[PDB]
From a paper:
Bacteroides ovatus GT6a represents a GT6 clade found in more than 30 Gram-negative bacteria that is similar in sequence to the catalytic domains of mammalian GT6, but has an Asn95-Ala-Asn97 (NXN) sequence substituted for the DXD motif and metal-independent catalytic activity. In previous studies we have functionally characterized one of the two GT6 from Bacteroides ovatus, BoGT6a, finding that it has a similar specificity to human HBGA synthase, catalyzing the transfer of GalNAc from UDP-GalNAc to 2′-fucosyl-lactose (FAL), and similar acceptors to produce A-antigen-like products. BoGT6a has a GT-A fold similar to structures reported for bovine α3 GT and histo-blood group A and B synthases (GTA and GTB) but is shortened at the N terminus by 45 residues or more as compared with the mammalian GTs. The structure comprises two contiguous subdomains: the N-subdomain (residues 1–97) that includes four parallel β-strands and three surrounding α-helices and the C-subdomain (residues 98–246) that includes a three-stranded mixed β-sheet and a small two-stranded β-sheets associated with two α-helices.
A monoclinic crystal form (form III) grew in 0.1 m Bis-Tris, pH 5.5, containing 0.2 m (NH4)2SO4 and 20% PEG 3350, and diffracted to 3.50 Å. This structure includes 16 protein molecules per asymmetric unit that contain three different ligand configurations clearly shown by their electron densities. It is less ordered than the form II structure and has 16 polypeptide chains in the asymmetric unit that comprise three groups. (i) Chains E, F, G, H, O, and P have intact UDP-GalNAc bound to a compact conformation similar to chains A and C of orthorhombic form II and designated structure A. (ii) Chains A, B, C, D, I, J, K, and L have the hydrolysis products, UDP and GalNAc, and a more open conformation similar to chains B and D of orthorhombic form II (designated structure B); in this group, the GalNAc is displaced and reoriented relative to that in UDP-GalNAc. The surface diagrams of the three forms show that C (chain M) is slightly more open than A (chain E), whereas B (chain A) is the most open form in which both the UDP and the GalNAc ligands are exposed to solvent. However, it should be recognized that these are structures stabilized by being incorporated in different locations in the unusual monoclinic crystal lattice.
Numbering used by the authors: -1 to 236
């Protein structure tokens, strides 16, 4: 029985060093109720992950480094490679960036209701209480991620997205079609990683919208307490 939770994680290249503290924080804060089984789906090129030889929930998946911009553009194309084992092993899906870190215990409060659409979005830390006129949406009608001015509620970031497995997999398949449709039209959506997810969140507003506290950049001073910290990529330790 219990509730199955799946974590989508990509750390190809030099971002594999972010897995250690992320895993140690997820095992201490993220879903530690007795009704939660947590599964790690790590997409990397590293031959072995941290605590992989001890933990069985850590699924090392073959994935080379695609570089820019395919590492953020073809992100959802990677998730569909194992979409056959995702719905059978998980009930909820969650995507976190590499350099993310848990600081506060996260429970069932971020779980979308059973009646709603079952989607999850996170407000961008750079756009809090800023007007719609300052949103960096895709303003080209030729692209599939096009959002006209005046429309939209929040500016969702691509650093953190989730929801139930059934609704989240449809989200991935929808965007993948939007990427390939733009590839044929010789056009690249901007910003590809977050503009595409805002177009979907406009057509399909998420059940619950997380504050930028779950995407708090390290060093900033934002009007909320940091729950999930975006670690600085340019630190001497990294
Ligand atoms: O070589 C790379 C570059 C990026 N990422 C992933 O892409 C996400 C966003 O990275 P970002 O675009 O901020 O890095 P940049 O492309 O600016 O170097 C992160 O969660 C990384 O895990 C990756 O796996 N390998
Ligand atoms: C790198 C990051 O956190 N993402 C975005 C970046 O892509 C760009 O949209 C910028 C200005 O809108 O806001 C952030 O820095």
């Amino acid at each position: 029985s219990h509730m199955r939770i799946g974590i989508l994680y990509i750390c190809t290249g030099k971002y594999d060093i972010f897995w250690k503290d992320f895993y140690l924080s997820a095992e201490r804060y993220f879903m530690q109720d007795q009704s939660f089984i947590i599964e790690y789906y790590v997409f990397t090129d590293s031959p072995k992950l941290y605590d992989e030889e001890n933990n069985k929930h850590i699924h090392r998946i073959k994935q080379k480094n695609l570089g820019w911009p395919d590492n953020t553009l073809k992100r959802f194309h990677i998730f569909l490679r194992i979409k056959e084992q995702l719905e059978r092993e998980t009930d909820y899906l969650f995507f976190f960036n590499a350099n993310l870190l848990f600081t506060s215990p996260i429970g069932k409060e971020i779980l979308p209701p059973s009646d709603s659409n079952g989607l999850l979005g996170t407000m961008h830390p750079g756009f809090y209480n800023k007007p719609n006129s300052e949103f960096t949406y895709e303003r080209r009608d030729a692209s599939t991620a096009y959002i006209p001015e005046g429309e939209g509620r929040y500016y969702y970031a691509g650093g953190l997205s989730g929801g139930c497995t059934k609704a989240y997999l449809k989200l991935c398949t929808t965007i993948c079609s939007w990427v390939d449709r733009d590839a044929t039209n010789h056009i690249i959506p901007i910003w590809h990683d977050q503009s595409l997810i805002n177009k979907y969140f406009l057509d399909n507003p998420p059940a619950i919208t997380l504050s930028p506290a779950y995407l708090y950049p390290e060093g900033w001073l934002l009007p909320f307490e940091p729950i999930i910290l975006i670690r600085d990529k340019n630190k001497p330790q990294y």
